[PDB]
Every structure is written in structure tokens, then in C-alpha cells.
Design a protein around this nucleic acid. Structure first.
Lengths: 636, 87, 36
DNA sequence: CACACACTCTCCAATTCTCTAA
């Protein structure tokens, strides 16, 4: 502690708004680098320097006021890169014991502090001016090393998880990430990233710039981002007032339902009743104590508690909630998406795929590739759609690449038990890219150009002719697990399956498409009967449970697919389940049932079919209890 | 000591289980077309009562989540195909 | 049956045909026009 | 003190891992 304190304090003193450096500050930062290179496994020097706030106190002023001293400046850059190194790299993995997890949290906290400090615009101003000089110069080993360390510093400062206990910030208040992005915008380093992506002379940095862009966009999604016009602020003011109004009215309605559920007498107003026609758990009739108003809508679980499901059985949950970034940052990010899609997408994505071909990329950089393939394609689909700006990734090669990556992640999820959630998150990225490619090949049919219509028919013909793109949905549904995959994965999978079946229906009903794969015959309803499985309907019902929280498009997709599977294939008895009937009971008893007309009508249809079967025979009630295989044909 | 009930296939094939479920709806009546919500409420009320009598420890939805899995087992399945049709 | 064979051949040719798109990449320009 | 908090300690059994038949 003492030697580190002496060496760090040796660097310089800060006077007001100016920083004065001691003559041996270069040797001082070299000593700090030496200590960091000889840390303990607890990352003790990183902890101590973060606690001392030496980065904010000394290195940022040195960066912003003594960048002319080049031998000091590059050492300061390397030191900042080492200090800002992400905690997962510092420890190798997320620890699983209390002491090392505490050390991880402490280092992470100091990374929060570093990210908050780097939002000062002068830091990225100096970095952008330096990198501008370097790219004008671009060439030496030291020069490209300095470029790499500047880009790694930007990557490091962008890549910290936000401590949302302290960043517990509302709808469009500027987060630390928002302020960092705004500082990048004001310093003009976004223009340098655009130059690196658009330029063909230095494509080795294209992978790094893709990483920088992927870390820039984390809260945002393209459909909302593309619609941020200049007049959006006034619209969002009125929208916020309307949302508050409907929320308050909903809460008042819920309060009144609860008030009418209980009586108007006080809690200890006694009196007990016997329900003569209702047996208790014994032989005698049930004695009820909670009042007539609780009997008016009687349930046999009023007094019970939920069960403690064990840790290994609990469902997965969402890792994020949609706080928007500040509106100015949203405008800047929309402009960045526009310029990136126009000037940068094709060359950068070709260079990144070339990097994957050369196989010098790290072990999971295709996740960044598939992120961009989802994000910027969907941004192009939003607002004015133009396939010419994004032509490169429409190749069938991208479909094959996504398919092999998705199947690899699927197998690793099924085998690599200790890392299954991360493999699920990678498979979700691949699924999202696949969905967006299905969306764009759907979209371009509406375009007026015969050439891209020809390209669309080519892509659809080969993609529906090749079987492995087709059977992947059945594989995903058959091995979907709520315990590992969040509800957003299931939502995206259902949306993708609905879109894929829609396009396949249109293709088969407008063209022959008579053979698949070595040709073998094919018809559309044969493939649809594959989805007539207990697991598939179980997953669809699992997503249907959240119908209030689901988007309207998600409800449309789920009810459309279930209505297809029940009506057109004539397999209503597959959907006869008692959990499903509880879902329908809550759906029909919903006060907001009028907003879900398709869902309630479908529920009444399937219920009418069930009660027809029940009127035929009493066996329907017993068969309703248990999930059911192809022997359902007895019931039908 | 430790006389804790379990809700396994032996519980489900007990008298209160599927043999009872074969008979609980003998007293029931339904309105049919255009009143499927009311018929559903009566249906869930009857089977919720049956679940409560069979295994009072659980809430109804949790009981359904248990039993929908537990029906796969061979003992309760053989008793199911006995209850279906007749012995 | 001969029609089935001809359908297989023609759809093979259609799915094998290369893509045609309104491809472009915009004007190259040095870092000065980007940064300032 | 005899009737309640708080903690430790013990064995039962609830759920998953692995091998096998349909």
C-alpha cells in the first residue's frame, strides 16, 4: 500500500482547473504499470488504484493537458487500457465463491467510476485528435499499436455493465452510457469510426470497429430508433401524459374490484357459513369463514400460499428492461445508423466475414457479426427501405452461416451444461438474425424493382428447397427450456416461426415448389403436421400465459398459429388441457377481455368443441388432465 | 413420524384420484352453445374442488403443473387406460 | 411425371441463378472530410 | 419458571444424472 501510494502520488498535483506534472511522472506511470503487471490473483493493485481514484485524479488531467509529451502519453494510454480492462478478463470468468466474487464486484465498481469519469468530452477530444493524426499518417509497429490501444480503451470504457442500482434512472434520463455516447459525438470520434468502417485501406480494424459499434448500441432497438423524428419530443410529452392517465385508471379499477371482492364490514366482523352441497377434505361439508362476498366468486385456494419451487427448477428472467436513452442521444444514434448503413455496412461486413474466413478473430466474434446483421438490417426495414445499401448480407451464404452457428449454439447449449445460459443468449442472437433475414426477404417483394424481386424469388426458392433451414424450428421447439431461455427468446421464436410459415404458405400457394433437398416430394400441410406435437403446443401456451404483457403482434401470431393448428389440421383435442383451460378462464374473466377479441373468440371456439366432446362422453374430463401424444386421434 | 404426503402415482390412483374424477361430473350440468365461459367456470370449480380433496397442500394451478408432468409415469398411465373404457 | 422432372430441372436453374441487386458503395474520401 | 426467538444439527426425500429398452 505505502509504496504504491508513494509512486502514484509522485505523478502530479492539480491546481484548480490545471494539472502540474512532476518531472519523473513518466517513470512513475511505468512503475504503476509494473505493479499492475505483478498483481495478486485478487487484482489487488487494480483495487487499490481504483480506490485511490488515480485514473480520474491524475491520468485524465494528464491525457487532457499533457498529450504533447508523447513518451508519457503512450504510457498513460497503456496504463488506462490496463486499468479499464473488463472484470471478466481480469478474473477469467465470473467467480462462484464469496471472496473472489467480492473482488470482482469491487473492480467492477471502480470500472463504473472510470466510465462515469470518461464522459468528460476533453478525453475523447484528445483521443480523436490523436487518432486523426495516426490515420492521416497511416505506418509503423508503434503507430498501429497506439491505434489498437486507443480502440481498446474506447472498447473498455463502452463495455462495463451499468450498476442499475445507482443507475436506477427513468424513461429517458441520460444514463452514464448516454453521456459517454454524447461525449463521443461531441468529440467527433464517431466520424473516425465511420471513416474506419468506410475506408478500405485499414480493414484490419473493421472487427474492432464492429465491436465498438455493438457496444455503442445496447439499450436501443432499430424499430424505435429509426422513427425518432425532429418533432418527437412534443409527441412523447403527450404520450407520457396518456400513459400515466391509463395506468392510473387501471389501478383505480383494480382497487374497486378488490374493494367489491371483500365486504364493507371490518375484518373481525365474524360469522361462519356451511355450504351444504360441497364436501370438505373430510366427510363433512365445508365451513367457510371469509364472508359471503368471498363466497360470491369462491375459489378453493383463497387461504393458501404458493409453493417454494427449488433453485434448479426456477424459470429464467429478462436481463434488461427498456429504458430509452435521452432524445438527443437517440437522434445522434439514428444519424449514426443512417451514415453507417449508407457508407459503411457492405465494406465493413465483407471485411468482418473475411476476418472470420482468415480465422484470426476471437472465439465468439461471429456473435457481433450476427448482432449487426440483425440490427442494421432491421434499421433498413424501418423507415425508407433500400436493399441496395445492404446488398451484401442478402446472400444465401449468410443464411448458411447463421444456420450453422445456430445449430452449433444449440448443440453446445444441450451439452455444455455449465455455460448453457450464455449459449442460449448466443442462439438467441442467431435466431434474431435469421428472423430479420426472413423479414427483409418478405419486405422486398413489396418493392417495385423487378431485379430485387428476382433475387427474392431466388433466395426463397433455395432456402425452402434446402431442408435444414426448414426443420430448425421443430428442433428449437422440441428442446426449448424456460429454465434456461428467457421469454423474449420464445417470443422471437414464435414471431419467426409465424413469419416463416406465412412465407412458405405464400410460396407454395403461388408456385409449385414440388420437391425438397436427391429430390423428394413435398407438400405444405405435411410440414404443418410436424408442429402438431405436445411440446410445441405447450411452448405456445407458455407464451400465451402472458397475453396482457405480450405485444399485439405477438398475440396475433400466437392465436393465428394455434387457430391454424386446431382448425385447419382438425386437432382441437391436442389443445384440450386443464392448464390451458385455466388460462382461458382468466382470459374470459379479464375486465380487459374486449381488447383481445381474437383470443377470446378462439377460446370460446375450442371450449365449445370440448363441451361437445364432453356431452358425447365423460372421458373428456379425464383426458383433459394429461398432456397427450398422437393417440389424441381417439378424442378427435 | 415423518408422515408427509407426496402426490406421486400412488396418490393419483387412490380412490380420491382418477377413480373419483371419473364420477365427479355425474351431478354437473352445462348450458352449451354461447355460454362456454359459464360452463368453463363450473368445470374448473368442480375439478378445483376435486384437486383440493385429493391433495389439499397445493394451490390449484401448482397442482395442475405437478399432475400434467406426473401423468407420464407408467403406474398412473396403466390406471388411466383402465379408467378409460373399463376394467 | 415428365412434368415433375421438368419442374425439378427448372426450379434447380432458378434457385441456382445468381442474385441481381441495386448494389453500390459511395464515394471514397480521406479522413479530413470525415473529421472536419 | 414455562412459553417464545434464534441457532445448530440430523436424516428424509425431492429432483436431477446416467444407463437401458421400446
Amino acid at each position: 500500500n505505502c509504496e504504491l501510494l508513494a509512486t502514484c502520488s509522485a505523478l502530479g498535483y492539480l491546481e484548480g482547473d490545471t494539472y502540474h506534472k512532476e518531472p519523473d511522472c513518466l517513470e512513475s506511470v511505468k512503475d504503476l504499470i509494473r505493479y499492475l503487471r505483478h498483481e495478486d490473483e485478487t487484482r489487488d493493485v487494480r483495487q487499490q488504484l481504483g480506490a485511490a481514484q488515480i485514473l480520474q485524479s491524475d491520468l485524465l488531467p494528464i491525457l487532457t493537458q499533457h498529450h504533447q509529451d508523447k513518451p508519457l502519453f503512450d504510457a498513460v494510454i497503456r496504463l488506462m487500457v490496463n486499468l479499464t480492462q473488463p472484470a471478466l478478463l481480469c478474473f477469467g470468468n465470473l467467480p462462484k465463491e464469496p471472496s473472489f466474487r467480492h473482488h470482482f464486484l469491487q473492480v467492477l465498481t471502480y470500472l463504473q467510476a472510470y466510465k462515469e469519469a470518461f464522459a468528460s468530452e476533453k478525453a475523447f477530444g484528445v483521443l480523436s485528435e490523436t487518432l486523426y493524426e495516426l490515420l492521416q499518417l497511416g505506418r509503423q509497429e508503434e503507430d498501429n499499436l497506439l491505434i489498437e490501444r486507443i480502440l481498446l480503451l474506447v472498447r473498455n470504457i463502452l463495455h462495463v455493465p451499468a450498476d442499475l442500482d445507482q443507475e436506477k434512472k427513468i424513461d429517458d434520463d441520460a444514463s452514464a452510457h448516454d453521456q459517454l455516447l454524447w461525449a463521443i459525438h461531441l468529440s467527433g470520434l464517431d466520424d473516425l469510426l465511420l471513416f474506419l468502417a468506410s475506408s478500405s485501406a485499414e480493414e484490419q480494424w473493421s472487427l474492432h470497429v464492429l465491436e465498438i459499434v455493438s457496444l455503442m448500441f445496447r439499450d436501443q432497438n432499430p424499430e424505435q430508433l429509426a422513427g425518432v423524428g425532429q418533432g418527437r419530443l412534443a409527441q412523447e410529452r403527450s404520450a407520457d401524459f396518456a400513459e400515466l392517465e391509463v395506468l392510473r385508471q387501471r389501478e383505480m379499477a383494480e382497487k374497486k374490484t378488490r374493494a367489491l371482492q371483500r365486504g364493507n364490514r371490518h375484518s373481525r366482523f365474524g360469522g361462519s357459513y356451511i355450504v351444504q352441497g360441497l364436501k370438505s377434505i373430510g366427510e363433512r361439508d365445508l365451513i367457510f369463514h371469509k364472508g359471503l362476498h368471498n363466497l360470491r366468486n369462491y375459489s378453493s385456494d383463497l387461504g393458501k400460499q404458493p409453493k417454494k419451487v427449488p433453485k434448479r427448477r426456477q424459470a429464467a428472467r429478462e436481463l434488461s428492461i427498456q429504458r430509452r436513452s435521452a432524445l438527443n442521444v437517440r437522434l445522434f444514434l439514428r444519424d449514426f445508423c443512417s451514415e453507417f448503413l449508407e457508407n459503411c455496412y457492405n465494406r465493413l461486413m465483407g471485411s468482418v466475414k473475411d476476418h472470420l474466413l482468415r480465422e484470426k478473430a476471437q472465439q465468439h466474434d461471429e456473435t457481433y457479426y450476427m448482432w449487426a446483421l440483425a440490427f442494421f438490417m432491421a434499421f433498413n426495414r424501418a423507415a425508407s427501405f433500400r436493399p441496395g445499401l445492404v446488398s451484401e448480407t442478402l446472400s444465401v451464404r449468410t443464411f448458411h452461416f447463421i444456420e450453422q452457428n445456430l445449430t452449433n449454439y444449440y448443440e453446445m447449449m444441450l451439452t455444455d451444461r455449465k455455460e448453457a445460459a450464455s449459449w442460449a443468449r448466443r442462439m438467441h442472437l442467431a435466431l434474431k438474425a435469421y428472423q430479420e433475414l426472413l423479414a427483409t426477404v418478405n419486405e422486398m417483394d413489396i418493392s417495385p424493382d423487378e431485379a430485387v424481386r428476382e433475387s427474392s424469388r431466388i433466395i426463397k426458392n433455395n432456402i425452402f428447397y434446402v431442408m435444414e433451414y426448414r426443420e430448425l424450428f421443430l428442433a428449437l421447439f422440441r428442446k426449448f427450456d424456460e429454465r434456461c431461455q428467457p421469454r423474449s427468446f420464445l417470443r422471437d421464436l414464435v414471431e419467426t416461426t409465424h413469419l416463416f410459415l406465412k412465407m412458405l404458405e405464400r410460396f407454395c400457394r403461388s408456385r409449385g415448389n414440388l420437391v425438397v433437398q436427391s429430390e423428394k416430394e413435398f407438400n405444405f400441410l405435411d410440414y404443418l403436421k410436424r408442429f402438431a406435437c405436445s411440446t410445441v403446443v405447450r411452448a405456445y401456451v407458455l407464451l400465451l400465459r402472458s397475453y396482457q404483457q405480450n405485444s399485439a403482434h405477438t398475440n396475433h401470431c400466437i392465436v393465428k398459429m394455434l387457430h391454424r393448428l386446431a382448425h385447419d389440421l382438425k386437432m382441437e383435442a391436442l389443445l384440450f388441457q386443464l392448464s390451458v383451460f385455466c388460462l382461458f378462464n382468466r382470459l374470459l374473466s379479464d375486465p380487459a377481455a374486449g381488447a383481445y377479441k381474437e383470443l377470446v373468440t378462439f377460446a370460446k371456439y375450442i371450449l365449445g368443441k370440448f363441451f361437445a366432446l364432453a356431452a358425447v362422453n365423460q372421458k373428456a374430463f379425464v383426458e383433459l388432465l394429461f398432456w397427450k401424444n398422437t393417440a389424441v386421434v381417439r378424442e378427435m | 413420524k415423518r408422515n408427509i404426503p407426496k402426490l406421486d402415482a400412488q396418490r393419483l390412483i387412490s380412490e380420491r384420484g382418477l377413480p373419483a374424477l371419473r364420477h365427479v361430473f355425474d351431478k354437473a350440468k352445462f348450458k352449451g352453445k354461447g355460454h362456454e365461459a359459464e360452463d368453463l367456470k363450473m368445470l374448473i370449480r368442480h375439478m378445483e374442488h376435486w384437486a383440493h380433496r385429493l391433495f389439499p397442500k397445493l394451490q390449484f394451478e401448482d397442482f395442475i403443473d405437478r399432475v400434467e408432468y406426473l401423468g407420464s409415469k407408467k403406474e398412473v398411465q396403466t390406471c388411466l387406460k383402465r379408467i378409460r373404457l373399463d376394467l | 411425371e415428365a412434368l415433375k422432372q421438368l419442374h425439378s430441372e427448372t426450379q434447380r436453374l432458378i434457385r441456382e441463378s445468381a442474385l441481381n441487386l441495386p448494389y453500390h458503395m459511395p464515394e471514397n474520401k480521406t479522413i479530413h472530410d470525415f473529421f472536419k
